[model samples]
Target: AQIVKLGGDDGSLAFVPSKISVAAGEAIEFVNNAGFPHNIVFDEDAVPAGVDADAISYDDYLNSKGETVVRKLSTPGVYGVYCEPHAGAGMKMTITVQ
Candidate 1:
């Protein structure tokens, strides 16, 4: 399993260890360690074998702690994604399944 941290404490945005490689059937956990109300929106065409790409978010409310999203890599291919609201910044990360 792989763990990816989202954003930062100083209101900065990023995906830690942004580039990654894993084997098929591996798992990735996206944790909202810092920042607020961030999300990971997978690119449709970039996902392995056109998997059902969905949006995942975290830390949207003060009363609630954001839930971590765990994704199971099923196919061996390259995947891409960006922080949903920050997509305008054009920062993207790559995930490859081997």
Candidate 2:
């Protein structure tokens, strides 16, 4: 397992290695280093035009108390992720599984 730290206090989302090339079924962990509340949300695309990714509340894990969250990528594809509270601040990352 590896950890990736988000780089801000206003809330941020960072993928471990930023650009990961992993075999299918490998797990990657995302750590929330921001001082404020944050959550990790995944979407197939850019969430939506002018809509907060957090507000959309599709399917995600929350780290409002500033704790590390872990997620496993079982399928081979590209995943888009963001902080619900900081998506507007450009707090986003992508994961590629092969």
Candidate 3:
């Protein structure tokens, strides 16, 4: 069971529990917590071998408050996740798969 919450109404450009671990075949729920529109844009540079980043949710939503994107992690490696709109401000997280 994994859930990563994006920036909330507190006006924080941060992800709750910015680091996590899970089984290769597991999944994570990326939930929008308000504050500002946010998304997880997976780029080529952070993708693991034998895995296409698209397997995960290339969520490009300007969140409408409380939406959630469920992402399946079928690859075994480190995944670099980020809030596209806030990445420059260091709004990102890591998912390690075993």
Q: Which candidate tops TM-score?
A: 3
- Positional deviation of 29 in candidate 1, in angstroms? 0.7
lDDT of 1 by residue, 1-98 (tens): 89887765455667777899988888898877666466777788788665767643232431223557888777778888777666665446799989
Judging by lDDT, tell me the better candidate of 2 and 3: 3
Candidate 2 local lDDT, 1-98, one digit each (tens): 65656554433344334655666666566655654455667774643334353443334544454466665555566667766666786767776667
Steric clash pairs (candidate 1): none
Q: In terms of lDDT, which candidate is stronger, 1 or 3?
A: 3
Tell me the lDDT of model 2 at 10: 39
User: After aligning candidate 3 to the native by TM-score, how far in Å is the CA of 91 from where it should be?
Assistant: 0.7
- Candidate 3 per-residue lDDT, tens place, 7-82, comes to 8557778877789999876778877886668888776678788777765646676657668877777768888888
> Each candidate's lDDT (Cα)?
0.70, 0.57, 0.78
Sort by lDDT, top down from the best = 3, 1, 2
By the TM-score metric, which is better: model 1 or model 2?
1
How much is the lDDT of residue 6 in candidate 3? Answer: 85
Q: What TM-score does candidate 2 get on C-alpha atoms?
A: 0.63
TM-score order of candidates, top first? 3, 1, 2
What is the Å distance of residue 59 in model 1 from its true position? 12
Error of 1 at 26 (Å): 1.3
